[PDB]
Amino acid sequence: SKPQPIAAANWKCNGSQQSLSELIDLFNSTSINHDVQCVVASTFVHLAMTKERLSHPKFVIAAQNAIAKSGAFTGEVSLPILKDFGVNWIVLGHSERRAYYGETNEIVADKVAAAVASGFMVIACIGETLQERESGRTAVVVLTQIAAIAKKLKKADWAKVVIAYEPVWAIGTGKVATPQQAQEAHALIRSWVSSKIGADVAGELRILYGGSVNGKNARTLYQQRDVNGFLVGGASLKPEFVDIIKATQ
Which residues of the shown chain bind its own copies in the complex (CB under 8 A)? Answer: 10, 12-17, 43-49, 64-67, 70-78, 80-82, 84-85, 91, 94-97, 100-102, 171-172, 233
- 54, 28 contact by CB (below 8 A): yes
Does the active-site annotation cover 128? no
Residue of 46, 94, 103, 186 marked catalytic:
94
**AA identity, residue 79:** L
Q: Which is nearer to its own copies, 48 or 176 (CB)?
A: 48
Please tell me whether 58 is known to bind a ligand: no
Residue of 96, 128, 166, 186 marked catalytic:
166
Q: Render 45-61 in DSSP notation, one character per residue.
A: TTHHHHHHH---TTEEE
CB of 195 to its own copies, least distance (A): 30
Please tell me whether 105 is known to bind a ligand: no
CB of 84 to its own copies, least distance (A): 5
Does the active-site annotation cover 94? yes
Burial of 223 (0-12, 13-18, 19+ CB in 10 A): exposed
How many Å apart are CA 87 and CA 83, to the nearest integer? 6
CB of 140 to its own copies, least distance (A): 24
Q: How many other CB atoms sit within 10 Å of the CB of residue 131? A: 12
Q: Which is nearer to its own copies, 204 or 240 (CB)?
A: 240
How many angstroms separate the Cα of 138 from the Cα of each of 70, 132, 190, 196? 36, 6, 15, 18
Q: Which residues are annotated as a binding site?
A: 10, 12
Q: Which residues are annotated as a binding site for substrate?
A: 10, 12
Active-site residue set = 94, 166
